[PDB]
Amino acid sequence: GMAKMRAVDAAMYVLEKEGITTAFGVPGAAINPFYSAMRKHGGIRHILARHVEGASHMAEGYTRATAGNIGVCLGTSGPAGTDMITALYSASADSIPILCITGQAPRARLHKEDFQAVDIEAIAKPVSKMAVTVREAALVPRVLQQAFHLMRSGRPGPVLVDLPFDVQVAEIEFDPDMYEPLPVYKPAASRMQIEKAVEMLIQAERPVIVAGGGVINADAAALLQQFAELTSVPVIPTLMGWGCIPDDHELMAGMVGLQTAHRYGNATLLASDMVFGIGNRFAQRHTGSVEKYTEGRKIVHIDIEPTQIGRVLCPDLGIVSDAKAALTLLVEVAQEMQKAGRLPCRKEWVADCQQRKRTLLRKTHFDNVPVKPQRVYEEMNKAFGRDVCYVTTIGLSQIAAAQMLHVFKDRHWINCGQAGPLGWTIPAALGVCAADPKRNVVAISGDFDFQFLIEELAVGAQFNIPYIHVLVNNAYLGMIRQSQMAFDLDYCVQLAFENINSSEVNGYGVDHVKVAEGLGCKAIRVFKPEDIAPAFEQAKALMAQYRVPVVVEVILERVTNISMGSELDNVMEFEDIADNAADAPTETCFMHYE
Amino acid sequence: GMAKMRAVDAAMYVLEKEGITTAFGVPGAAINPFYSAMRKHGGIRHILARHVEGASHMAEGYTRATAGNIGVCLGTSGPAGTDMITALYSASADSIPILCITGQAPRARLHKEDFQAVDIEAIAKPVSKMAVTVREAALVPRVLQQAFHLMRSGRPGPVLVDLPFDVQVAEIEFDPDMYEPLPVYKPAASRMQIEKAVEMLIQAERPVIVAGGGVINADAAALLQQFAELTSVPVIPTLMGWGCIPDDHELMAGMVGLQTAHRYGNATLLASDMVFGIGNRFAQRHTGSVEKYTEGRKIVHIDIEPTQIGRVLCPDLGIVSDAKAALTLLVEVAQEMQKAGRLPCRKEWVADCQQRKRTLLRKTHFDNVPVKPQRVYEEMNKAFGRDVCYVTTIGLSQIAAAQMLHVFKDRHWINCGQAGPLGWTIPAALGVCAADPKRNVVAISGDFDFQFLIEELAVGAQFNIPYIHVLVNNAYLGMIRQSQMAFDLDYCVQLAFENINSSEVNGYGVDHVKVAEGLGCKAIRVFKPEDIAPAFEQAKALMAQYRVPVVVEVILERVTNISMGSELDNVMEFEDIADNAADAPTETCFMHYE
Amino acid sequence: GMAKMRAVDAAMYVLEKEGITTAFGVPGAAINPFYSAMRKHGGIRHILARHVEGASHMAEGYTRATAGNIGVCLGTSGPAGTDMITALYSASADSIPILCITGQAPRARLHKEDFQAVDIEAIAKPVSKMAVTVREAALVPRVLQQAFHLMRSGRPGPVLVDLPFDVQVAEIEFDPDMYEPLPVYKPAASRMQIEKAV
Ligand SMILES: Cc1cc2nc3c(=O)[nH]c(=O)nc-3n(C[C@H](O)[C@H](O)[C@H](O)COP(=O)(O)OP(=O)(O)OC[C@H]3O[C@@H](n4cnc5c(N)ncnc54)[C@H](O)[C@@H]3O)c2cc1C
Ligand SMILES: Cc1cc2nc3c(=O)[nH]c(=O)nc-3n(C[C@H](O)[C@H](O)[C@H](O)COP(=O)(O)OP(=O)(O)OC[C@H]3O[C@@H](n4cnc5c(N)ncnc54)[C@H](O)[C@@H]3O)c2cc1C
Ligand SMILES: Cc1ncc(C[n+]2csc(CCOP(=O)(O)OP(=O)(O)O)c2C)c(N)n1
Ligand SMILES: Cc1ncc(C[n+]2csc(CCOP(=O)(O)OP(=O)(O)O)c2C)c(N)n1
Ligand SMILES: COC1=C(OC)C(=O)C(C)=CC1=O
Ligand SMILES: COC1=C(OC)C(=O)C(C)=CC1=O
Numbered sequence A, B: 001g002m003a004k005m006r007a008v009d010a011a012m013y014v015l016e017k018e019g020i021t022t023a024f025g026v027p028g029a030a031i032n033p034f035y036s037a038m039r040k041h042g043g044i045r046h047i048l049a050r051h052v053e054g055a056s057h058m059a060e061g062y063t064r065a066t067a068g069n070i071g072v073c074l075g076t077s078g079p080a081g082t083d084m085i086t087a088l089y090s091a092s093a094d095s096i097p098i099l100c101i102t103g104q105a106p107r108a109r110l111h112k113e114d115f116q117a118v119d120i121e122a123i124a125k126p127v128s129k130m131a132v133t134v135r136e137a138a139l140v141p142r143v144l145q146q147a148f149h150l151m152r153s154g155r156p157g158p159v160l161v162d163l164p165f166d167v168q169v170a171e172i173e174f175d176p177d178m179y180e181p182l183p184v185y186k187p188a189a190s191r192m193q194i195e196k197a198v199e200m201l202i203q204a205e206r207p208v209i210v211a212g213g214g215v216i217n218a219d220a221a222a223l224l225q226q227f228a229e230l231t232s233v234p235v236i237p238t239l240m241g242w243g244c245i246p247d248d249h250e251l252m253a254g255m256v257g258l259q260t261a262h263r264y265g266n267a268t269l270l271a272s273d274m275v276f277g278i279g280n281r282f283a284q285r286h287t288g289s290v291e292k293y294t295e296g297r298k299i300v301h302i303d304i305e306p307t308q309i310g311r312v313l314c315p316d317l318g319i320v321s322d323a324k325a326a327l328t329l330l331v332e333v334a335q336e337m338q339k340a341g342r343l344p345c346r347k348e349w350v351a352d353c354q355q356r357k358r359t360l361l362r363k364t365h366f367d368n369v370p371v372k373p374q375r376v377y378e379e380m381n382k383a384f385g386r387d388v389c390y391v392t393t394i395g396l397s398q399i400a401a402a403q404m405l406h407v408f409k410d411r412h413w414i415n416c417g418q419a420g421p422l423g424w425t426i427p428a429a430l431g432v433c434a435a436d437p438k439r440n441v442v443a444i445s446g447d448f449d450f451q452f453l454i455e456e457l458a459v460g461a462q463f464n465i466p467y468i469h470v471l472v473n474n475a476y477l478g479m480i481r482q483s484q485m486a487f488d489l490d491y492c493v494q495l496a497f498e499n500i501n502s503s504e505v506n507g508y509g510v511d512h513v514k515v516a517e518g519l520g521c522k523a524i525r526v527f528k529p530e531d532i533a534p535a536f537e538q539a540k541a542l543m544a545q546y547r548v549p550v551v552v553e554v555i556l557e558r559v560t561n562i563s564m565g566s567e568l569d570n571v572m573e574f575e576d577i578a579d580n581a582a583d584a585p586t587e588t589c590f591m592h593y594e
Numbered sequence C: 001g002m003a004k005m006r007a008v009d010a011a012m013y014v015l016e017k018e019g020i021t022t023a024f025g026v027p028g029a030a031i032n033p034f035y036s037a038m039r040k041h042g043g044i045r046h047i048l049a050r051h052v053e054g055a056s057h058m059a060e061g062y063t064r065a066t067a068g069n070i071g072v073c074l075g076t077s078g079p080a081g082t083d084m085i086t087a088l089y090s091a092s093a094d095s096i097p098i099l100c101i102t103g104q105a106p107r108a109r110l111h112k113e114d115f116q117a118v119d120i121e122a123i124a125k126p127v128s129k130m131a132v133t134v135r136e137a138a139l140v141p142r143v144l145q146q147a148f149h150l151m152r153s154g155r156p157g158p159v160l161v162d163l164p165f166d167v168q169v170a171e172i173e174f175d176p177d178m179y180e181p182l183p184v185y186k187p188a189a190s191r192m193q194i195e196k197a198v
């Protein structure tokens, strides 16, 4: 029971009781006592990153992989904590938690300029639910106790706990047998709110459900699908809700927005007369101008967070609720409505939505050399199984990937949708693989994103963490070239150079095969579209043989303008569209996934 | 004269008038109008980094290379600014400026959750002299005007200017002919302060001058040397003052402190009876416990910043002054004292200091295989000229480098002494080379530091920026292994693995030769100490032939404990010491530098 | 049912549903729409103080008198909010709530040094559970809703809600019949812990 121990030793017991099994980090002097407590206790597997920013995005990928996970990022004082701010922001921005833990100078030296002492508490406050420097050894378990409550409760978000060196080694009395995690706070909608929501839905003639990341955050995907099935209401996932209903489900109507969106999704939204928003916010890249998004449409918004309702547009009905609590009641009420014969038939509207989905496509089957990126995603859809789990960040790489890939389960699209920090992809994919070694992880990056934290590939090598990284290389910051067209500009966005060690990259600059191999991984370069499929097959084999990350690099044409625009009804199609399966053969309507 | 133009166009004129010629950055949508204004104006050379953190440390190296430089770091909204916090902290910590400029969401969307909008103003305030989101296009030139005043005035520090997209493109009237930079504020010591300081110095029997980074910040190195020469007072540079008097000068008595210090420096400090502090603070890694540092010693402290005086110890005389202003008066008064025959002769004390410098050494001439790191620095001292400019960060690599290398001019030790963020080295070295293409830049990194921002080597390749990067590889976070010995720990600090592409690295993990070559650079690996010197000669030749960075990787023995301790009189010597030149042949006392 | 009304009218219904019956305050131009909403709605008795600090300590005493009470203090922009800081500190320090409502300059003028405009949200943050300038009229009922959850939950403490003039008078749709106070968060000890203490 009760025993004297260092505060960091008590921290290990608290972390174990809170369900922690894994951590990502970089040690240093100020945080060594915690690493000492970690070795003494056992039970936490540590993964050494090759940049603190890498440890922080591994923690994010780990949280995002499986409901209830909380990725832990560990580092020392000073610049370790400032290297975590981007992940804290990215996690806050998407409403998911990570636990960052930093060492700090001893308390009695905090406002001297002690070597590598920084006011991380002040720096991190804007991007966290709590950021605190612990000033008493006895408070170390209590601060972690409150941190876990906050990471799980309400709108989730991350916490940073900063530990002065003397506070870590100080002796306290602690009884692990008596430690208990705090209850989690989640408001639940009342039956009166839900019945009103269902009455309005029944009165709608052309409704859609917009299913957001809150559905996934709540672990409520099956209830979301069940509710749409009972009501026969087509579902539009936001980018953060993608996967909560399978992409080949008859009611999944595509995605909506200015960029990661389908032509049929935007058309179905503009044709609808109600948006039943569950666990979404209404993000600007999803809505365009809100006046157009809402024209002629009733709007329902269910959100766990009161100050998200009415933030960007006025709902006709706002309801504060956890999405699982709300969907449980939504299923119950809809079942009562169905037994009563009060749910309308929706065959025509569903058929109209399915007709747009069959016809309003974008071409992917390009035989061009140099390769067209949209062909890469067609080959990815064929190569990988229905259980594929994609990890990606930002770039034309990622935008077209969301337009053209398909996903069939929640937490199989792992994407930092609101903050999009370049370099996120490799560490996030490693964190997912650490969360679930059976998961079939495939990452997508453009060349610039791949370069930011390219050294994290050696983490996969050292720890034998296998996954496939698709690398689509245009030797450009392609997304930025495209947005510079508005200024008739093409300026400081090219990565090309004649590589003095590799004439075979033909002026594309960095040799990603040589870099990946030097970092202990396997790599294949593809120049022709017909070689993409064999390469993915070789990659699966090399992954099994060597158990390390395997990079498949596809050399792209330098310039491809991905479809996008400023309003739902203004998306410009630069590349060829399609109305036939031959040009877009991996749309779920034409292809059986696995 | 007067003309309508975009606020970013006026920003270009202001930057030109303020002396800006170079910028480092990563563009994106929110900052595109500024890149557009940069292309239209000409006159700023942009260097594209391969991580925003890389652009930010390039800006630091550029500032640090030449007095009056201000490195500029450019990036977009959201995670670009959070990727700059580590450099802002590192620049603040050493009292040097950089100008960070971020794009931002349009004003009318600032507290909506606009895509990639973050409250960078709040996040950056703790690590900057000013961090402001500009809310009127007409204020853009005025905010830059105040930023340059603050970066130059008082205790220098960095500024972040955040630019909403609509503010950037808005039209203003601006007359570049009428723009004038603000006057710079620097307090100057009165003659009464300086005469009192010189009286106390004259009364001292065994004084030393501790010369800090403020001397270099003020561009006052020649006056510092002249004052020591007039008074015949030995000079101890802090790590940030290193180079303000040449290492082979008869009065340069070595460095002092817990780690980057000489055995003779610490002995001379403890034997002294006054510390005449000029432009130093008294950092904890320099003093140890202040009660021991000051025992039996009068203390003078001259600092430009009033709240630095008395911060960690009580001076007998504190003086607020710019170091150049103070040294100008110090030279004048000492000359008046010398004409009056009032300066004491100091032959015995100077001879006693020189005797410690001749005798209290650490061995570097090791023929061991695997190589001993101290041998690398001996070879570096012989290979490179007196004009060598070293760039380094932290690690046992850097600590022993400061113990064993030698420098002969100010701004030839470029080192982030207070914050030490791993990954700083490559971008900082590239920023120095951009500041001065004739400078003879040689960087030192351990393997972990080298890996953090390893992709920046491709910036050197794409832009043909030549320098030599010495890479001392123990496949360890060596500094952390050593500090873990206090906990009888060796845990999560090893980088080794059997590289499936390189049996020739013999279990050391990452193949830095293959990675450097894939990134477009040249690289040589050295296994035996006698091959170090030829490798540096090949490296100079490859640098001239290809004009790209050239990495020389020395494979070290896995474990070497570098000398260090907790007090000036407690530094533990783990490796062999030396009292003879044969074991330490590159001490300036035994070797003529160039 | 749902109806068009100003944000401050919607605030009156929220305050009524949350049990408010009393307010202590000092009016001014920037909070006049709220006073107009009070007069139209009726059912909140206003006590006019002769110092804003006096209103803010009246609010405290009203809270402390009776379990479940939340004193409400009302002021205009600028110096009114800075006059409430001492009471926000006193209420925080004893773990009891008051609800402070200040008027504020319109959003389009928030960083333009407008007459009697101050960053009260920055000043009050150290002495409150929440201090927020409300930037959308539709958020007024929701900010008030979260404030009442915060003042009742956990360790209780005060809240400052700061209302730009244009936010107060803007029209919104709001259904009073659908408004519901949020559940109060209070952790409970398990039986194992209580048996150990006994
Ligand atoms: C280049 C790029 C292009 C993009 N293009 C698009 C596009 O065209 N369309 C698009 O939709 N997105 C797009 N995105 C993503 C976009 O920026 C947003 O990240 C996303 O739309 C937000 O999803 P959401 O509305 O589900 O909100 P989320 O960020 O997922 O959050 C929604 C709400 O969930 C709530 N919540 C949290 N937990 C719970 C719970 N347990 N119960 C209930 N509610 C809960 C939160 O309070 C929050 O308000 C793009 C991103 C990038 C980088
Ligand atoms: C691993 C490691 C080990 C280290 N070991 C040591 C060691 O043993 N010994 C050591 O000394 N350092 C060591 N350092 C460096 C140390 O941490 C500090 O960075 C350094 O000692 C501070 O130098 P300084 O006192 O000159 O202060 P600086 O940081 O250079 O600043 C000194 C003062 O200059 C003032 N100033 C600025 N501009 C002007 C001006 N124009 N005129 C006058 N004053 C001005 C500022 O106000 C400031 O107070 C180490 C660093 C690392 C990473
Ligand atoms: C840290 C950071 N800086 C800048 C950006 C802005 N940004 C978005 S996409 C992009 C270029 C990405 O290029 P690449 O990964 O090669 O993808 P491509 O668009 O070429 O497919 C940039 C700089 C960002 N998201 N994060
Ligand atoms: C971002 C960051 N995280 C952690 C540290 C702490 N730290 C100081 S030295 C070191 C290891 C450096 O290893 P390497 O560069 O290989 O040098 P070696 O000591 O082995 O010569 C670490 C992690 C730091 N300075 N910065
Ligand atoms: C990509 O590197 C860059 C150049 O290289 C050609 C340029 O010419 C310019 C103007 C900007 C730049 O970033
Ligand atoms: C029969 O299965 C199919 C659907 O579901 C009915 C569809 O909605 C579409 C577009 C195609 C299809 O094959």
Ligand SMILES: COC1=C(OC)C(=O)C(C)=CC1=O
Residues within 6 Å of the ligand: A046, A047, A048, B491, B492, B493, B494, B495
């Ligand atoms: C360097 O990677 C690491 C290991 O690998 C052997 C370990 O066994 C442990 C315990 C920590 C770690 O970071």
Ligand SMILES: COC1=C(OC)C(=O)C(C)=CC1=O
Residues within 6 Å of the ligand: B250, B354, B355, B357, B358, B588, B589, B590
């Ligand atoms: C003659 O030159 C020399 C010195 O300066 C006198 C010294 O201080 C030392 C230690 C050696 C030396 O050779």
Ligand SMILES: [Mg+2]
Residues within 6 Å of the ligand: A446, A447, A448, A472, A473, A474, A475, A476, A477, A478
């Ligand atoms: Mg690219």
Ligand SMILES: [Mg+2]
Residues within 6 Å of the ligand: A051, A451, A452, A453, A454, A455, B051, B451, B452, B453, B454, B455
């Ligand atoms: Mg990197």
Ligand SMILES: [Mg+2]
Residues within 6 Å of the ligand: B446, B447, B448, B472, B473, B474, B475, B476, B477, B478
């Ligand atoms: Mg090392």
